[PDB]
Amino acid sequence: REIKIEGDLVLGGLFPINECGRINEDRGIQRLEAMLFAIDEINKDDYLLPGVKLGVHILDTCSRDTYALEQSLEFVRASLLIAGVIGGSYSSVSIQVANLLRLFQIPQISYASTSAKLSDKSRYDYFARTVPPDFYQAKAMAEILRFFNWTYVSTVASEGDYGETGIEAFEQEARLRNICIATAEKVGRSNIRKSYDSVIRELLQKPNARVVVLFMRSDDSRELIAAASRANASFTWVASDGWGAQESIIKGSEHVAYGAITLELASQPVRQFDRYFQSLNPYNNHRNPWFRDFWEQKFQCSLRNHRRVCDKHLAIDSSNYEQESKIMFVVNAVYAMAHALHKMQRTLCPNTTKLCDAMKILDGKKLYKDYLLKINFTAPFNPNKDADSIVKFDTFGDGMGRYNVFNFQNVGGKYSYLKVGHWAETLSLDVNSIHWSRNSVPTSQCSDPCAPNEMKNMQPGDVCCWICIPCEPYEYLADEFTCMDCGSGQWPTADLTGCYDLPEDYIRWEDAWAIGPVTIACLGFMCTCMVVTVFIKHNNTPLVKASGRELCYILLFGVGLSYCMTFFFIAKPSPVICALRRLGLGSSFAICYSALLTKTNCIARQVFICLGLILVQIVMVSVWLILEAPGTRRYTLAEKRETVILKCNVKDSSMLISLTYDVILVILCTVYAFKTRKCPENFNEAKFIGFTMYTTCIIWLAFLPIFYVTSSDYRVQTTTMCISVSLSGFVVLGCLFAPKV
Amino acid sequence: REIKIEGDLVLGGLFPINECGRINEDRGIQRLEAMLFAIDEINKDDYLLPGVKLGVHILDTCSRDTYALEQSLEFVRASLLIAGVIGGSYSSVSIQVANLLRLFQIPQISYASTSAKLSDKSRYDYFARTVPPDFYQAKAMAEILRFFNWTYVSTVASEGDYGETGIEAFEQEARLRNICIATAEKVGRSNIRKSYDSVIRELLQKPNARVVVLFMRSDDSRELIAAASRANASFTWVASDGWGAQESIIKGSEHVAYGAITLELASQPVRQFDRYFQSLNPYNNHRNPWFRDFWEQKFQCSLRNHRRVCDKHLAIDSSNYEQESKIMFVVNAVYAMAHALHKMQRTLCPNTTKLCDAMKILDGKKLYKDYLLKINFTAPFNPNKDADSIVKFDTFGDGMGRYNVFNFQNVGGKYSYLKVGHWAETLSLDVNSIHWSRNSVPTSQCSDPCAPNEMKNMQPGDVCCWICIPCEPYEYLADEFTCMDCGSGQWPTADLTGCYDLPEDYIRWEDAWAIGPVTIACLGFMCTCMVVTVFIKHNNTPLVKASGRELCYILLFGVGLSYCMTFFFIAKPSPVICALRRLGLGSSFAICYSALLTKTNCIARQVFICLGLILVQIVMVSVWLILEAPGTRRYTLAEKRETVILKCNVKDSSMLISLTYDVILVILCTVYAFKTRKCPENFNEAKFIGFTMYTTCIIWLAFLPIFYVTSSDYRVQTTTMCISVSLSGFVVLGCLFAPKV
Numbered sequence A, B: 001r002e003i004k005i006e007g008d009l010v011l012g013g014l015f016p017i018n019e020c021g022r023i024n025e026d027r028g029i030q031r032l033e034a035m036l037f038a039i040d041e042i043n044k045d046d047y048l049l050p051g052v053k054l055g056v057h058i059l060d061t062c063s064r065d066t067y068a069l070e071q072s073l074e075f076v077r078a079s080l081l082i083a084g085v086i087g088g089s090y091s092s093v094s095i096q097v098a099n100l101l102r103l104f105q106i107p108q109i110s111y112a113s114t115s116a117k118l119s120d121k122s123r124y125d126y127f128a129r130t131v132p133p134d135f136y137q138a139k140a141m142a143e144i145l146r147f148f149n150w151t152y153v154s155t156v157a158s159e160g161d162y163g164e165t166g167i168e169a170f171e172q173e174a175r176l177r178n179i180c181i182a183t184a185e186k187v188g189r190s191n192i193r194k195s196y197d198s199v200i201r202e203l204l205q206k207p208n209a210r211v212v213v214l215f216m217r218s219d220d221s222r223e224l225i226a227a228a229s230r231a232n233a234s235f236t237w238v239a240s241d242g243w244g245a246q247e248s249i250i251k252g253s254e255h256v257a258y259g260a261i262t263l264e265l266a267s268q269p270v271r272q273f274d275r276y277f278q279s280l281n282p283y284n285n286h287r288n289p290w291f292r293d294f295w296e297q298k299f300q301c302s303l304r305n306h307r308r309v310c311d312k313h314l315a316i317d318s319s320n321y322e323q324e325s326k327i328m329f330v331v332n333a334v335y336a337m338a339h340a341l342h343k344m345q346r347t348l349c350p351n352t353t354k355l356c357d358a359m360k361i362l363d364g365k366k367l368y369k370d371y372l373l374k375i376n377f378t379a380p381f382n383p384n385k386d387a388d389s390i391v392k393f394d395t396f397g398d399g400m401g402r403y404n405v406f407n408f409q410n411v412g413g414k415y416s417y418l419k420v421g422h423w424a425e426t427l428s429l430d431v432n433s434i435h436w437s438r439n440s441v442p443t444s445q446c447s448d449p450c451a452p453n454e455m456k457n458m459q460p461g462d463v464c465c466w467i468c469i470p471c472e473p474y475e476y477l478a479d480e481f482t483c484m485d486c487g488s489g490q491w492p493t494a495d496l497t498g499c500y501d502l503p504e505d506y507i508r509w510e511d512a513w514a515i516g517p518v519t520i521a522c523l524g525f526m527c528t529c530m531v532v533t534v535f536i537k538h539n540n541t542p543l544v545k546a547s548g549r550e551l552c553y554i555l556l557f558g559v560g561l562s563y564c565m566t567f568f569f570i571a572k573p574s575p576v577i578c579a580l581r582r583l584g585l586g587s588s589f590a591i592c593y594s595a596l597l598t599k600t601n602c603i604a605r606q607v608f609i610c611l612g613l614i615l616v617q618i619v620m621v622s623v624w625l626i627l628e629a630p631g632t633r634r635y636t637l638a639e640k641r642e643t644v645i646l647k648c649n650v651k652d653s654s655m656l657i658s659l660t661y662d663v664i665l666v667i668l669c670t671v672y673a674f675k676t677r678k679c680p681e682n683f684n685e686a687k688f689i690g691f692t693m694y695t696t697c698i699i700w701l702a703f704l705p706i707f708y709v710t711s712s713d714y715r716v717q718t719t720t721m722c723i724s725v726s727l728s729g730f731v732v733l734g735c736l737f738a739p740k741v
């Protein structure tokens, strides 16, 4: 089981064919028929090793680490001849052969070993890939979980030298663009969490992690899809090139990965392969001893007594297979050895064409410094040469990171893969053909964004998580993380940034006071109207002649003003109104004192009536000073969180100070009118004035101490002030008209 | 630089000597002079390979991975002779030589390679240690962070195949005994966090992680102590056997690790070593070419023109060195090869003694199945044979986990290590000789335990962290995580589990009422006393004869009872007292109705006085029914969070219902006594009774509507009820005595 065609030079090469059940049919013998294709297409091509036939010596690796070492001794046991192997297509296969070809100085060219450990050039100093490392693959998994703003993800990586050193470079590149990984764990096949149902349940315990980064190998992604359909669930499988663009890892679970996003490595494929690999039947196939049963296992044929025996019209056309992505890399990484062993011949022995004596030892260290910086044109089957087709190794012997972004679009019945994107500067994937799980762009964040009514961003200690919590309704949410207050008087709008002020109320609308006391004040116009018969119609009455005929024009005209000052208590507050209420209340109780205590010396006496007529302005001039000097415009009281009630610019004691200027003259009114409690003059002094000395001004000391207790203060001061003069309007001044007529 | 002494058989062995600056002097040539000691002590010992001389072929490893492979080819390049190597003392040295000795079937016996990857017997099937794995070392780091209850730790492990597979078995054994690791990171020498100041600052950003699990190698623990003293800080270094019991990793930082707890592997050392290694001078030392400059580098001597040249009286006694712990393991793991190559000779060729023809090929696979189950007595220098000294491999080729627990006690000036503990069942370390950092048993938990006044355990989503938060003061903290309420009436004690009830108040102490109204009631005894002159002294008065002489014994005796029912309003509430208040208040106002409305028909009238004398019990019999049928015991009102005020078992309307039974007879009292407002009989009816018809019962309708408004209800009903009868006690019944005398 090893090909041996002779040649003046020998190229090695060890390929994963077995897996020893299957022949692997996609990344296996579809690559061994490509490297052997290029060797068949070198010896015919002149000006590239002319006259020096290249022969190969190929062995399988059985897709296993410690079996590759037993097959790697077939090269070097003649050295204790080979001028370079073509590496191993897997990762753990090609690490622990570079730890044995290093000792004999044999160069190794891998073509798929995307691992980060193989750039430490102090240990593997004979290892140049033609595939970019996995640091440029975590960089395409941070810029693809930020173009969709997924933040709360859950990474899964297989154990070994591929996952654990390709996910330790993702956790140090997802904690740099604020991506919060929930659950990271191993899945590998040596007793960590080897039950695949024990790890698909852990990804189901989190309900808010629908984006799972599958950085696993090609073995633990056909046993994590065959264990994510039994224990039935679904996510958005974002996966590395372990999954890749393989249509044989998904052969029996075509509905659970129906929105998967995988990224292969970008390759414009070769177009002379499908005229060669398609024309290889088991009848005409000599060299490789694994191709004689490849068509047996692929087409399920036979050659013991199994199913349908091979008919000769069974070939491999484009209805069977699609050419693998990493077939450009196989024919590229074998010409790089063919450009090294040609430029060496142009240096050591340029006069001769065949193998000289100076190139018969094959100095390995000199072969690694004539080759590591060797750029070239291309694999010559791919056109657009200058448009990114230059094979070129870096200082570490790598390629350039060029990553297509595939998608598992299940649209045409046949569940096929489909390209959407790019890399190397550009995240250029177009969201118009990407199908998804449940046909929607999914979200995975730690906490949901909530309503902007009272919530706020409260991130306790980290960046990826927060919590929305209600705050006060009088505040505004300005900085979107802590709401702030605007103060009393103003109320925030629906935007929760600015606050709008409020007026007081419609005091004059009804309030059970815009119709009640003004109807009592509607009869207040009838107090002076009913007393107008004493005024002008019957001014020559003998009882009025013995009364204060000049005094009743002060005693009853202001009684109508006491029935008129309540009108200003219902209008809008203003310096023309609420300061006039300070001028009105002093004028209203300028009659209850000047017609009770003064009329004891006038109506129950004109030699001193000039001082009594000047007694109304005895404090009213000083009351004019307190109605002019302090602030007499407006105010606005603010109670608990909803009050804009606009009282005038005084206090309760300021009205009490004006109340003290007149009621003290009414306090000693009945004390100065207690002597005439039995003896009248015209049956009116002891019969009427003593009643208004007691009963009238007691109401002036009843509701007035209650004026500083109430809150709305609607009719406690408007009605009762106008109602208190109706006693002294009728029982002493309208009472005289009762026996008149 | 390789020892070669001949023999009929050959034992290998590769030791870490260089590091190529130092000769490492503790784990290096103090081991190579021990394996070569046992080979010098085998050929003299009969009955253990008799007549077959054992020769060694020893090479250095330079303490490096990929340099051991260039020296491992010196054994096997004659096979493309050696009958077994004695392994590599390091971890990464002895993994990637078992991946090359496996191919030629050569057994390898390590003696310090404590790693968990080397028990996967599908790959390294020619590798039997004599040191227990690292799964039994994480099991001694979970049971040592639970005996001190440290929970919030921060693990640090070096990169490679020792740390990352010895700390991935600690994180899966610290999340099993509730130990919450804060910061886990790599420190290894390939561009992860290779600045050691960048990782000692990350352990300083957490202020609550003073316990750091140092699972690093012997290289990143002399550059993490030489970078934890420059950027000066201190912790409690709990460290694996990378640190171990080495007194050369701490040579210049003897104060920063002064409370360190390290665990080596338990070994009762050999006692024939210090008679052999102490007697090896550079004059008499032939074989090993590294010992000729070992004493040059150890004693800082010379042999270009450096310091003090070697005098011949310079030897190595017990004042220089202490024998390493893993020297029992070197002489043990080389006799296991000597018991394998002896029991094979007793099987294949027992008739002859020397090497026969059947043992001249040295079948390697048969050498690994005659040996892997081979128990033996001991290395024969260690006594107490049956007391745990049996060399024995398990099914995976291991030892038994026996771990001493050292301590860096800096007590004697010379900062020496000191043993405290044990393992293999028992955490038996005794906390009486353990010095610490700052002489205290440290703590590292996520959140501190708080005061039990109002706090509670609030663990949001995890187990390792919580938060203490204050709750209500009327609740008790029962379950130590959520405080619970006990309800009104009872108040929790200092234990915050049980609640104690409260009485109401001392109502009769002062309350501005235990001296005020009772002094007014002290004169209440003087109302009947001043009226006693009308009672017995002057009962034959003509004004009293025209008055109700039989009626005043009902009108004034109950007036003293109205001055006596206020006494029950100050005593303790009870069915004898507060239900008597219901019987008293009806009896108190059985006089204000029967001497105002009834005395209008008696004192201002005996043909109908028998119905008036029966009018006191006209509703009092039904008032006795409501004083007997409902609940008449007690009650207890509970206001907001502090109130146990015990009113009697009625409502305010229940007293109002008793008030409605008598005051309605007093409501129509003045209406029935409004006719005699001008005409008296003995100048007492229209002059006194009409005053008590108006002024007395108006006070009965003044304070009684205020009795259901007050909260404390101290003197609003006790004083004013007794004060209201003083009007009808004096102005109508004491007023008649005023013109009498």
Ligand SMILES: COc1cccc(C(=O)N[C@H]2C[C@@](N)(C(=O)O)[C@@H]3[C@@H](C(=O)O)[C@@H]32)c1
Pocket (backbone or CB within 6 Å): A027, A063, A064, A089, A090, A091, A092, A112, A113, A114, A160, A162, A216, A217, A218, A219, A241, A242, A326
């Ligand atoms: C089955 O045993 C193992 C062990 C380790 C890895 C893998 C594995 O899945 N390798 C995958 C991913 C790959 N990009 C890489 O080199 O890791 C290349 C691509 C290829 O060559 O076709 C494979 C499999």
Ligand SMILES: COc1cccc(C(=O)N[C@H]2C[C@@](N)(C(=O)O)[C@@H]3[C@@H](C(=O)O)[C@@H]32)c1
Pocket (backbone or CB within 6 Å): B027, B063, B064, B089, B090, B091, B092, B112, B113, B114, B160, B162, B216, B217, B218, B219, B241, B242, B326
């Ligand atoms: C300097 O380069 C390296 C690389 C890897 C590990 C180490 C290392 O520190 N090994 C330490 C710890 C050990 N118990 C083990 O076997 O890992 C044995 C004990 C000994 O044999 O004396 C050493 C050093």
Ligand SMILES: *[C@@H]1O[C@H](CO)[C@@H](O)[C@H](O)[C@H]1NC(C)=O
Pocket (backbone or CB within 6 Å): A146, A147, A148, A149
């Ligand atoms: C997150 O990314 C999505 C992807 O288009 C975008 O629509 C959205 O606006 C982004 N959110 C923020 C806050 O930038």
Ligand SMILES: *[C@@H]1O[C@H](CO)[C@@H](O)[C@H](O)[C@H]1NC(C)=O
Pocket (backbone or CB within 6 Å): B146, B147, B148, B149
């Ligand atoms: C935690 O361990 C220490 C170590 O002795 C012990 O004293 C303490 O009581 C333990 N705490 C609990 C809650 O068991």
